[PDB]
């Protein structure tokens, strides 16, 4: 969607969380505020948007 028309999603249990996105693109920014990017897998993020 466009920058003004940015979307929103309410992820809640389906397949797998991460370690897949760690290559989805050859080069991609992974700026994380708070949670450490390397510690993103075994946490439990309750209310998450996309």
């Amino acid at each position: 969607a466009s920058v003004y028309a940015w979307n929103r999603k309410r992820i809640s249990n389906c397949v797998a969380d991460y370690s897949v996105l760690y290559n989805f693109a050859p080069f991609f920014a992974f700026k994380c505020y708070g949670v450490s990017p390397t510690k993103l897998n075994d946490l439990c993020f309750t209310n998450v948007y996309a």
């Epitope: 080069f27 920014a29 992974f30 700026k31 990017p37």
Partner: nanobody, 124 residues
Framework: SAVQLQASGGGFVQPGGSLRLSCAAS????????MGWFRQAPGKEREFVSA????????YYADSVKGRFTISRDNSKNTVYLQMNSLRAEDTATYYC????????????????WGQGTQVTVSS
């Protein structure tokens, strides 16, 4: 951050010759830092050469490389070049394609990521 760098090029340049290098980038990073080269003169300390902004808004040059160095990023394959004009005969060094993983370079000494050394001698 975990960033892999893909540098290639070099050869055997001559007094008054030139280089046209390349340095591709791949890997997730905390921020979009600047690519470039930290060349140590043979037996010397690692020295900043010429840094381009990731958005291609800031260019940098140094006296040891002014007039005979320039850095530019490929818009197609995202491989930042090191293309120059009339490089002198003293640059018989090994050139590391270092990686400042910061959006702005307050000082060049803290170089989060680095690259491979490019050993090019300058003689005919």
């Amino acid at each position: 951050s975990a960033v892999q760098l893909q540098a290639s090029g070099g050869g055997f340049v001559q007094p008054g010759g030139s280089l046209r290098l390349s340095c591709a980038a791949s890997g997730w990073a905390e921020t979009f830092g600047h690519m470039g080269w930290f060349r140590q003169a043979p037996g010397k300390e690692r020295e900043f050469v010429s840094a381009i902004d990731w958005w291609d808004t800031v260019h940098y040059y140094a006296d040891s490389v002014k007039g005979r160095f320039t850095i530019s990023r490929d818009n197609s394959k995202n491989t930042v070049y090191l293309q120059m004009n009339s490089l002198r005969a003293e640059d018989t060094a090994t050139y590391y394609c270092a990686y400042w993983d910061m959006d702005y370079l307050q000082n060049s000494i803290p170089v989060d990521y680095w690259g491979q050394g490019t050993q090019v001698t300058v003689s005919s």
